[model samples]
Target: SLSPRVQSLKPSKTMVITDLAATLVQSGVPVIRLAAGEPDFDTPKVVAEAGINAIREGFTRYTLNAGITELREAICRKLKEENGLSYAPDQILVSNGAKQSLLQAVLAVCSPGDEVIIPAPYWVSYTEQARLADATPVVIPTKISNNFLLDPKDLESKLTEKSRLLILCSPSNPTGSVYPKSLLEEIARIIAKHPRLLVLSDEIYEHIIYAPATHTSFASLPDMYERTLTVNGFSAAFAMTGWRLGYLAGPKHIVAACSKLQGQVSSGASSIAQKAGVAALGLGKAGGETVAEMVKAYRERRDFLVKSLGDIKGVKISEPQGAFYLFIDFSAYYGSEAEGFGLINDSSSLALYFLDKFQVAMVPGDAFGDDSCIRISYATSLDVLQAAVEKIRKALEPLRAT
Candidate 1:
């Protein structure tokens, strides 16, 4: 018999849609896939060269469970210089990706029956990882009118003795909501009152932020340094998703606990990837010119989607401050009957209709804990996004109450 833990885990819906899109494309369908969180850009040249050099220099070997000394030192420097956070190299634990770092942190900090507090419309892995750790996931809903930000009052009302960890993602995956500094300060105050509540700050999209909206490291907040486990990686920002290098920085005890768990599990991340990560950090503050170029492209795409999608009647959208996704509320079309498609009741059904009819693949918001919306990734080129927008518009035409 399979273990209960494996049975209880939910498969990632984002991956499900992405795979389905790929299958459709393979079967000769012209699918415009916007279901994945991956960036369309190639890994930065400097980083890729470092990986090649590492292989040539025979660096392909198992590194220490905590990671190579050079990468850890570099990660500490990056955290200190970019995020306004201080950490010793020993406080870092390198994992396969930020995903692993996040899961390891939850496993290390949460015990059975403990509550892992998370805001709604979260990254798909947050709640599942909590359950994988045998902890209860407590989800707090945030409104789209507030740009999907978590209200401090809602956070305050949800705390209890069982609350063990709070997972926060800025430049959020599905919603692309960036938590402002002032709001983070308010949240920090509430967390200060709860001694048992630790924070997992997922900053993978830190460098992808747009103008006027800034990235704030949760650990940088006053009195939060000791209580926050900062999770970041080279995936999104550096376009190194395939390389799979990510790390966690936190209090020594928690870091050591995760390191122990990782040591017995997957061991350290790839040696070549760690070497490349060192080069990625060497690209100067916030990934220097290469990442800046990518951000500029993302900004343009975000602008185009915000305007194009906003033009559709009854389709609600909030301009995302950062990240590449646009989580749009198309709830107005729900309960309407399409021409050939059956009644569209929720995000999944709507997404299925779009895929089957329009060949535009987007992840349904039901996977992200919100059924009123669906997420569209604009990581591809502007031309692709433009094509997707037209298809999406036509897909909703029949559902619009005339």
Candidate 2:
């Protein structure tokens, strides 16, 4: 018999769509994949060279379970310099990726029957990670009218003695909504009342934010550092998705606890990746000039898509403030009969309809706890994005209700 725990894990919806798109393309379909969360850009020159240098210098051996001390120091420096937050090397736990860091932190801090509060339209992994730790996932829904920002009042309403953790992701994955400093302060004020509730702030998209909308580090709030676990990595910010290097910075005791768990699950992360991470931190430490060009391209693409999608009838979407995703509501087209794929019923089915009938790949919003919408990542080139948008426009034409 298989372990029930493993069986309970939901397969990643993004990966599912990505793999199908790949297969279709190989079979000669001109699939315009907008499903993957990965950046289309290559890793920065300085960062890539560091990895190559590490390999050439034979730094491929195992590292300390907590990672190379210098890399941790670099991370600490980056946090203070960029986020206006402070941490020590002792509070950092490097892992294979931010996903692992989050899982280990959850397992270390949660027990059976504990509750982990997550907002709807969240990253797909949050709910599964809570279940894997034997913790109950409590989802608080937010409407599109609110720009998908979590309401502090709603958060407070859900807290009980069983509430152990609250996971917050800014520059959100599916919605691309960034919480401003004022909203975070309001939330922090409410959270201050709950002594048992700790916060996990996922900041991997910190550097990808647009101007006029800033990122406020949750841990940087007054009297909050000791209770917030900041999970971040080089993947999104530096185009290092394949590097598998991310770190957790929290209270000393929690970091130590996660390290113990990490020791058994996997040793230190890849040595070359850690070295490259150090270079990424160094190159972008003084405010992101190294990756500004990529961010500019993303901004252009986002503006184009938001404008284009808004012009389409029966499709609704709020302009994403940050990140590279566009979470558009396509429920207006639901119940429309598609001859071959059945009625366009739910998010997943609609997504498949797009892929099969339109040759465009996107992720269903159901995977992120909301079925009324779908997420499209504009992380590819302008030419590709332009063509994809046209295809999407044409695909929706026949679905209009009489």
Candidate 3:
């Protein structure tokens, strides 16, 4: 038998959906994949060139356990310039990805029996990571009416002495909801009142915001620098997901602890990736036109999807402020049965029906802590999206009232 911890863990549902879709496509079925959180954009030219240069220059050997000094320096500059938060090179720790950085932080701060508060409709890994650290995960629900944002009062009500950590994601994964500065200020005030609580601000989608809605780093708030661990990387923004480089920035003591934890696990991020990270950060400093162009494309896709989905009968959707996913509510279609499509029960069943009949792949919302919705990725081309929308529209036609 597997260990209790390993047994309790669930494999990522997004990957499962993607794999099945891929298998169908390989078997000659026409499948449109919109399930995974992967960006469809290529890695920026400057960043790619830096990685190639590092390989040619033979910089593949390991560096300090905390990561290369120059890369850390660039991160410090990024936090200061873009996020309006200041940090020293000593206050940063680089990991294989943001996932590892988050896990290291949880392991460093949480003990068995401690509680880690997370918002529902959350990324699939947050709760599992807390459990892996022997910590209890306390989920607080957020509504679609509120754009899936965490209310400060609800957060304050959920707090207890055992609440050791709170994981917050701006430009959220499943929902793509961006928490504005004012809302974060409210949440910051609530968090400051609880001296025992620490926060992990996941800002991986920081640069993907739409117009009028802005990205706010929770650590940038007043009196939050010491209590918030800022987690970010080049994966989403620089299209460097395959390179696997991410960093954690916080108070020196906490960062040092994460570094110690990382030392035993994956010692440091990819050496070439670190060198490329330096170039990515420099790109950010020099206007970040590449990222801006990608963001523009994502915004166009988002708008098209929101409008297209909204026009579909019984389908409910809200426009996302950032990121490249649309979490649409399809609860109204439940309990309906079609001749060839079968009976619809929940998000999962509906997702499979869509996949089998329409060849459109989407992730069930239950995997992200909501049972009434399903998530679609808008990272593909406009042509692919248009085809998907038509397929989805025709596929959902059978769900109408008899």
Candidate 4:
């Protein structure tokens, strides 16, 4: 029999829909998949070549459990130079991906009966990771009108002595809402009162941010450095998703604890990926021109979808400030029905209707703990997004509350 811990897990809804879409495509259906969080761009040439060179030079041996000194040092420098945060190399723990870094951090700091505070419309993994650590997930809802930002008042009300960790994802997945610095500062002030609370800042989408919306490292806030665990990786920003390398930087003791856990579990990240990560950091500040180009493309796609999808009757959209997703509120279309698709009551059913009828795959927002919307990733080409938008428009036409 499987352990209850393993049985308690929910298969990632994003992966579930993406796989279903892939199956349809495998059978020759032209499904325009907007369900995945992956960037469509290829990994930059410099980083790719670094991995190649590492292999050519036989740098394939298992690395130190905490990762190589060179990569950690590079990560330290990057944090200091770009994010205005300082860290010693020893405080960093490299892992398989940002996912692993996040999970390990959750495992290290949480105890049974502890509460992990999370903002709803959050990434799917945060709550699950909390549950994996035998911790309860306390979800606070954010409004779509407010761009889905967590309200400081709501957060303050939810805090308790049992609240051990608050997981934050700016440049958020599922909703590309980037939290402004002033808001973070306000949040920091609230966090200061809770001596037992810690923060896990997921900055995986840090470099993918759009302009006029700057990214802030939560640790950079006054007095927050000691309590914040910043998790970032090369996957989203550097287009190194396949490379599978990410790291956590925080207080030395917590990072060491995570490192100890990692040592027993997956060990160090891939030797080749760590080498490539060093080169990725060497790319000019915040991923340089290669990343800039991809951000520009994503921006264009975001604009296209905002206008196209927004024009659809009853569809509500907030202009995302960062990342590559558009979390659109289609709740207005709820309660409407179409033949063969019974009552479109929530995000999941509406998502299924879209997928079955129009051959478009998008993640229902219920997976992110909010059932009012569905997420559309603009990581694909503008051509594909435009086509998907058209299909989505047509799919919703019949559900227009006639």
Candidate 5:
């Protein structure tokens, strides 16, 4: 039997959508799967080639438990140059991916009964990981109409002696809402005065941004640097999710603790992935034409989704400043339903109802702690985008009738 603690933790509903879709497909129903958070792009050739070269040069064996000196140095430089955060090699820890880095941070800071403030629509994993640490998640929901970013006052009011950690994701997953720097500075100021609070900034989507908006690292802020652990990696930025390369930079003490925890659990990440990390760290917004091309495509897709879906009566969302998701409010259909379809009371049933009736795929906003919205990923091709939006439109037209 599983442990009592394990029994208490609920499985993430975001991933459950994947299994539900799988069952539908197994029954010979065509289903478009956009339920998971992943980039549709493949790993860049420059990084992949470096990994192959590492194997050729006999870098297959385990090097250091954290990572090689070279990879750590590259990570340090990348953070300083790109994120405007300075860190030494001793202040960095490499892990399997952003996922592992986050786990290590939670394990380092959290104790039983502590609470982690997660702003919703938050990433699905944050709550589960907090539970694994015997920590409770204090969710703060921010609506799509407000750009889906949390209010600074909400965070300040939620603080208590038991609130030891705050997990912040810039260019947040599911919603694609980038927190404004003014809002971030306010949060930083609040965190700075509270010496007990540690901030974990998940900046995995740093490179995929639209200007004049830019990513501002909480760690980059003065006085907050020592208390902030910035966890980022090559998965989303370099499309190396399968390679499993990621790292964390923060106060030297926290980095050491997290690295020790990682050493016991996962040891170092894949050696080849570490080698690839060096090349990926070398990449910048304008370094490669192909990288620019991909950024261009993402920009175009974001604009298209906003323009096309803006007038859809029930769907209202801001033009995301970064990331690939369009979080749309579907509350207009909440208490109403079309004939011949299931009840549409909550976000879960609304999502599945759309799937069964209109053949569209979207994650319920409830999964992210906001029940009135649904997340639509625009990571697919333009043709698929047009078709999906049209299907979504037709599916909701019935709600207007009755």
Candidate 6:
């Protein structure tokens, strides 16, 4: 026998995409995977060395339920340095990953029947987390016309006493639209009026932003200070994806609550990873140059991918403000057909058709709350990214003909 919750949840679509990629790889197919959002780059040498040294120094012991003091201190310092946030070490708790941090936040803040507001094309886990926590996920859809930004007016109407959390992912996961400070401030204003509802500002991609589009820390806002739980990790910025060290920062009470919850589930994140995390905290100070190079490479890939994708006819897309993905709209081909695919009906079939036909794997837009878009990550090398885009163009070519 199993719990109803465990049986009800579906596997993440992004993970499903990788599962197909894995099957292809197992069959000896040289799949040029642009699927998983993980960066293809290696962790910086200095940070990698720090982890090795920690293991060599025999720091395998669990430090605290929250995290090692040094790592939390680094998280606090990085928050202040990058987003103009002043956070105390105790107000920060290191977790296994930002995903865990988000899960804990939702569980801590929500009660049964509460509605957690997620703006779509959102990260898939957020909705599931809310569901597992016995809360309903209300997705506010954003469109390509608005550059995939959630309409604040739409968000404003969704709030009620039952609304428990609002998760804002700027430099967003799939869409890559970075919300400007003015918009951030405006949202902060709207959230301030609804004191019962807390905001979860995911700034994990804080350093991976693009020009003309800046990443603003929602927690750093005027009235939003007490209502935001901010998550920033080394995985994306330092190319330390497997490090499994992320920090959760919020009001003292919420931080303590999340730490308590994490303590019961997983005592603390890996100490060896936390050791490297100390260096990630020096984001703009010490490890600054490493990330600077990483950002430069990601930006270059963004440009190449945007131009390559723009060349594809009937495939609509916008240049992302940050992150390395382009959420492309395939709505124009809704009633059109190709070799094996009969019209672009929904996200799942479209993803499956591409995976089976061209050896290219992409997440369906439905996972992110929209059904007509596909998220193509460009974190791979420029050559690989270009090839993936070209392959995608060719894959959709048959749909353009009679």
lDDT string, candidate 4, 304-364, tens digits: 8898888788888989999888999999988997888788989999999999888899999
Summarize candidate 3's per-residue lDDT along 54-143 as a digit string, tens digits. 999999999899999999998999899988999999999998989899999999999999999999899988999999999999999999
Q: Would you give me the overall lDDT of model 5?
A: 0.82
- CA-lDDT, candidates in order: 0.93, 0.91, 0.90, 0.92, 0.82, 0.83
Predicted candidate 1 versus true structure: per-residue lDDT over 226-272, tens digit per residue: 99999999999999989998999999999999999998889989999
Least accurate 10 contiguous residues by lDDT in model 4: 393-402
Clashes of 4: 0
Off by over 4 Å in 3: none
- Per-model TM-score, in order, reads 0.98, 0.98, 0.97, 0.98, 0.94, 0.96
lDDT of 2 by residue, 242-340 (tens): 899999999999999999999999999999999999998888563378788878889999999998888799888978878899999988898888777
Ranking by lDDT: 1, 4, 2, 3, 6, 5
Best by lDDT: 1
Pairs in steric clash, model 2? none
What does candidate 5 score on TM? 0.94
Global CA lDDT of candidate 4, please? 0.92
Pairs that collide in candidate 3 are none
Per-residue alpha-carbon lDDT of model 6 for 194-289, expressed as tens digits? 878899999888778877677788888898889998987878888888888787899999989988898899989998998987765654552577
Scored by lDDT, model 1 comes in at 0.93
Which stretches in model 5 have alpha-carbon errors above 4 Å?
19-28, 285-288
For every candidate in turn, the CA RMSD to the true structure comes to: 1.0, 1.2, 1.4, 1.0, 2.0, 1.6
